[PDB]
Amino acid sequence: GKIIGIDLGTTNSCVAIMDGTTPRVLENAEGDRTTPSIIAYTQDGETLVGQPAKRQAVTNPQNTLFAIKRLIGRRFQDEEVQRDVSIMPFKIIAADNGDAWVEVKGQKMAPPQISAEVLKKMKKTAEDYLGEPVTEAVITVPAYFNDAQRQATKDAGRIAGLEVKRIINEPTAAALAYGLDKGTGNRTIAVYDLGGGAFDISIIEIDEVDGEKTFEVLATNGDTHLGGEDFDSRLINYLVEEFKKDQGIDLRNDPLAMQRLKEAAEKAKIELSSAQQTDVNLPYITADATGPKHMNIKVTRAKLESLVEDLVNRSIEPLKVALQDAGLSVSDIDDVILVGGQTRMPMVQKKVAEFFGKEPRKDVNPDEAVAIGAAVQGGVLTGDVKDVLLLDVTPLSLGIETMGGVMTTLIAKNTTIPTKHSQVFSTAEDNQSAVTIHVLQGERKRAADNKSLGQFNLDGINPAPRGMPQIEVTFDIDADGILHVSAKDKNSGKEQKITIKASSGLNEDEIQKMVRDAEANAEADRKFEELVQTRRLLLTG
Numbered sequence: 001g002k003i004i005g006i007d008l009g010t011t012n013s014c015v016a017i018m019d020g021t022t023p024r025v026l027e028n029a030e031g032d033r034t035t036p037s038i039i040a041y042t043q044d045g046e047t048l049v050g051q052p053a054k055r056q057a058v059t060n061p062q063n064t065l066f067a068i069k070r071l072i073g074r075r076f077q078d079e080e081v082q083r084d085v086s087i088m089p090f091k092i093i094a095a096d097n098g099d100a101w102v103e104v105k106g107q108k109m110a111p112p113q114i115s116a117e118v119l120k121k122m123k124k125t126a127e128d129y130l131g132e133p134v135t136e137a138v139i140t141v142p143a144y145f146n147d148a149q150r151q152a153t154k155d156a157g158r159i160a161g162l163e164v165k166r167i168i169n170e171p172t173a174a175a176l177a178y179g180l181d182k183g184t185g186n187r188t189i190a191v192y193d194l195g196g197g198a199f200d201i202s203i204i205e206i207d208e209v210d211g212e213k214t215f216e217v218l219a220t221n222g223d224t225h226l227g228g229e230d231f232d233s234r235l236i237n238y239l240v241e242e243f244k245k246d247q248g249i250d251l252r253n254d255p256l257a258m259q260r261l262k263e264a265a266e267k268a269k270i271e272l273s274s275a276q277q278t279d280v281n282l283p284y285i286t287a288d289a290t291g292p293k294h295m296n297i298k299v300t301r302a303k304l305e306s307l308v309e310d311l312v313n314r315s316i317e318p319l320k321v322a323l324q325d326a327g328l329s330v331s332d333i334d335d336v337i338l339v340g341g342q343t344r345m346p347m348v349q350k351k352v353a354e355f356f357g358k359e360p361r362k363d364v365n366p367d368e369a370v371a372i373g374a375a376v377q378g379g380v381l382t383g384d385v386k387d388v389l390l391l392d393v394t395p396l397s398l399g400i401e402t403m404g405g406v407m408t409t410l411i412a413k414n415t416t417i418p419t420k421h422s423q424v425f426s427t428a429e430d431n432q433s434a435v436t437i438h439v440l441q442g443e444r445k446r447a448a449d450n451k452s453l454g455q456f457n458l459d460g461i462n463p464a465p466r467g468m469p470q471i472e473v474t475f476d477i478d479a480d481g482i483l484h485v486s487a488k489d490k491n492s493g494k495e496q497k498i499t500i501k502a503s504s505g506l507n508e509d510e511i512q513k514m515v516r517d518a519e520a521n522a523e524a525d526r527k528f529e530e531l532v533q534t535r536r537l538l539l540t541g
């Protein structure tokens with residue numbers, strides 16, 4: 001019946017539910033509206049997840065798993081994983097198919113089984129609160145996720161025993177919370193998503209027409225080098241040099257010290273959004289030949305702002321990129337929303353306040369906003385929320401190059417994504433051995449008039465006197481907005497395919513110039529295609 005929304009965070013998870021008209025964030029078993037995303041394997045053969053798993057990490061670096069959201073769906077030879085292999089204290093291994101897996105206590109295990117454990121805790125958190133079993137779910141993912149990662153997010157839920165009703169991306173989920181507030185229609189909003197694992201900026205339009213509120217993403221892009229875990233690194237490296245300057249010991253090579261130090265580094269970081277000072281007292285952190293060593297160093301707040309200013313500045317070019325892709329001016333941008341626990345630090349809000357010239361909205365809970373919005377999607381699916389429409393549509397038509405230099409339209413503008421449709425084409429020459437599929441986007445009928453987005457060949461077409469082999473062309477734009485083009489020659493069984501990425505933005509000012517141009521040029525476009533018909537649509541070499 002009801003469909004729950006889950007914030008799958010790198011660092012914390014959060015559960016919320018629609019209680020009629022107003023959303024409620026549900027507490028986990030400790031009473032916390034957020035649960036750390038950490039998994040631990042104890043000597044006694046049981047697996048800890050959440051706040052219990054976080055606590056035993058300092059003595060169990062190999063069998064305490066955290067930051068598993070950085071491992072799901074990727075190949076081992078990726079640079080950051082090699083970057084990740086060196087810094088992480090637990091064991092990273094390759095799966096038989098080349099996937100990135102982990103191995104704990106001699107058991108080779110994939111991340112989705114591990115992440116499924118948190119959902120079961122979230123599931124049990126929901127089951128204890130509701131007193132009944134729960135099985136239908138909408139799950140969130142980052143906006144920069146590719147084709148392989150989202151499907152893997154669906155599968156992980158199934159290993160946790162869930163039917164995944166919807167995948168939605170995380171910057172979109174947090175915004176649903178904001179739109180419950182009054183006065184949110186007909187505005188342009190920016191979703192700046194800075195988590196533990198990455199930077200994300202999304203541009204979203206909130207429109208309301210004829211009693212229906214519609215939401216459309218105008219731009220998105222991401223940068224995985226600007227996430228909250230990269231900030232913690234910017235402290236682990238420095239802290240060793242101050243002790244080394246005073247007493248000559250390099251801690252980078254001591255994981256047990258590194259395990260307490262990250263915990264000391266992580267918990268204190270929360271404090272500096274509210275606080276101005278504190279003293280780190282971690283007795284017996286290590287020792288050398290002359291006996292025990294003790295940490296006691298006083299340090300305030302300014303130095304950190306000096307240390308991480310470049311990360312904020314390197315996130316700006318992705319912000320600058322987002323506005324061009326959406327085609328908007330600052331004067332079209334109506335509101336600022338903070339999501340994520342790290343925005344409670346004052347300089348980021350000021351750096352944002354200087355940039356936007358207005359204070360970010362203070363009514364969005366940074367630890368809970370993502371979870372609250374995902375719960376709304378469940379109410380839409382059950383009918384609990386009325387007069388709301390998820391808008392995800394194509395700005396321009398998509399197609400392939402055909403006979404005579406003609407574009408044949410396969411997908412008309414403003415069709416909802418995901419989508420798939422089929423059409424039959426044939427061969428142009430006797431005994432034709434090859435075809436070129438030139439993937440094209442635009443509103444003009446001449447193929448030579450569109451932008452090259454890529455092109456591909458399909459071979460193995462059986463020889464025939466022209467037009468007999470039957471080559472079926474499929475374009476698939478999946479729920480991530482990514483276009484999958486596939487081809488199978490039905491008489492032989494062969495299959496080849498390509499993938500075409502989702503756009504980072506939708507530039508309507510330039511698009512609207514092209515559309516008005518197209519209305520003015522309608523008659524010029526017909527005669528060319530009809531005289532190509534004059535000279536089943538055909539594909540060139």
Ligand SMILES: Nc1ncnc2c1ncn2[C@@H]1O[C@H](COP(=O)(O)OP(=O)(O)OP(=O)(O)O)[C@@H](O)[C@H]1O
Pocket residue numbers: 008009010011012013069142170193194195196197198227228229266269270271273339340341342343344345366367
């Ligand atoms: N009070 C606080 N002050 C400063 N930083 C905080 C606070 N609470 C949490 N953080 C930081 O915010 C980050 C987690 O934010 P959030 O839970 O929204 O991320 P996520 O959804 O887990 O990440 P991603 O979107 O990349 O998957 C962590 O770096 C954590 O250290």
